[PDB]
Amino acid sequence: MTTSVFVSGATGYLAQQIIALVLSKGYKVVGSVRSEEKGANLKKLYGDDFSYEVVKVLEQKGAFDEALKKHPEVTIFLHTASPVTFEVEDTEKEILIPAINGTKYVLQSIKDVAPQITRVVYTSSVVAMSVPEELGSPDVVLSEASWSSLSYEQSKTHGVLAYFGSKQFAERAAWEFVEQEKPNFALSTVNPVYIFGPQAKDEEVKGTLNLSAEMVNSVLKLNKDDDVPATTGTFIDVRDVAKAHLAAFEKDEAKGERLLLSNTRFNGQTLLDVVRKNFPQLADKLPVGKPHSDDFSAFKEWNDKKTKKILGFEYFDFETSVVDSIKQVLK
């Protein structure tokens, strides 16, 4: 009787938080995974309202055809699967193509075989809206209208620029598909910054230590003689990203929208100060730097007012998000 929701890349960090949230709202879920045992693991963790299908390669035409044919009860599709790595041999084969062609072929499969799908949400990224130097700029104001100027030729040259390109061009292709093919579904994208926060299941706190979360987790591996990490940027809590995905398919207002998911700026000093205050027993094992020397008052606030009005909830603050990540890891 209830609606089923399809989530590509269900093994992932964001994807599992999305899955745990939608299951809690009464939805069923069907998740895609690159292998059978990967499916089997998730089933044990999430229970009866979760099914999976093995889709090993995104960059094949009709890759999701069989999976979708087997699940007519699915009316919602959340495409989150994407290479999220900066380190590869071929930027193209390992990052650009599976993102760009993966995305094109999923939308085509939905149109071909799942005409009952009314909503599709694509997980994009702030990298689709800018170039590396602009993000760390204090005179740059990003908005839902922002598009990266990074060219495809330049995106190939190395790993970080490939990831920037992958998101920008996959998302473009997504909006171009909607314009050109005129599908039954309405499209919306979620564009987050660095994603922090606890993993969905404690049992998953062991391997595949995902890039973004690890930027918090790595602090615990410092020792008192190490330098303050130089990591800096803007954050959003994984649980807020999940709620945005939910709003991205439940709210009429979210149709045809890009949603910029960005909260506050932080650097390595912000991180150490939070961890040191909340986990005093680790203070002797950690560097000190210059507590509260961090100052972001010169940075123009990004324009996410539209996203904030559509979402209609308040975000987890940096300390809570970081605190909950470390709590779980220590547990």
Residue list, annotated binding site for NADP(+): 11, 13-14, 34, 38, 80, 82, 163, 167, 195, 210, 212
Nearer to ligand NAP, 183 or 192 (CB): 192
Q: Give least dist CB 58 to ligand NAP, A.
A: 5
Measured from each CB, the residue nearest to ligand NAP is: 12
* Rounded Cα–Cα distance for residues 254 and 257 (Å): 5
Q: Give least dist CB 59 to ligand NAP, A.
A: 7
Q: Give least dist CB 232 to ligand NAP, A.
A: 14
Nearer to ligand NAP, 286 or 322 (CB): 322
Report DSSP letters for 167-182, one per residue.
HHHHHHHHHHHHHHH-
Return the number of other C-beta atoms located less than 10 Å from residue 205's C-beta.
16
Nearer to ligand NAP, 18 or 228 (CB): 18
Q: Give least dist CB 42 to ligand NAP, A.
A: 10
* Rounded Cα–Cα distance for residues 325 and 199 (Å): 7
Which residue shows structure tokens 């706190």?
Answer: 205
Q: Give least dist CB 1 to ligand NAP, A.
A: 30
The DSSP output letter for 79 is E
| Radius of gyration from C-alpha coordinates of the chain | 20
Query: Which spans of this chain sit near ligand NAP (rule: CB under 6 A)?
Result: 9, 11-15, 33-34, 38, 58, 80-84, 98, 123, 125, 167, 192, 194-195, 210-212
Residues 182, 183, 184: CA angle, nearest 5 degrees: 130
Nearer to ligand NAP, 123 or 267 (CB): 123
Task: Calculate the CA 269 to chain-centre distance.
Answer: 24
The helix-helix angle for 159-181 and 97-113 (nearest 10°) equals 20
Nearer to ligand NAP, 13 or 177 (CB): 13
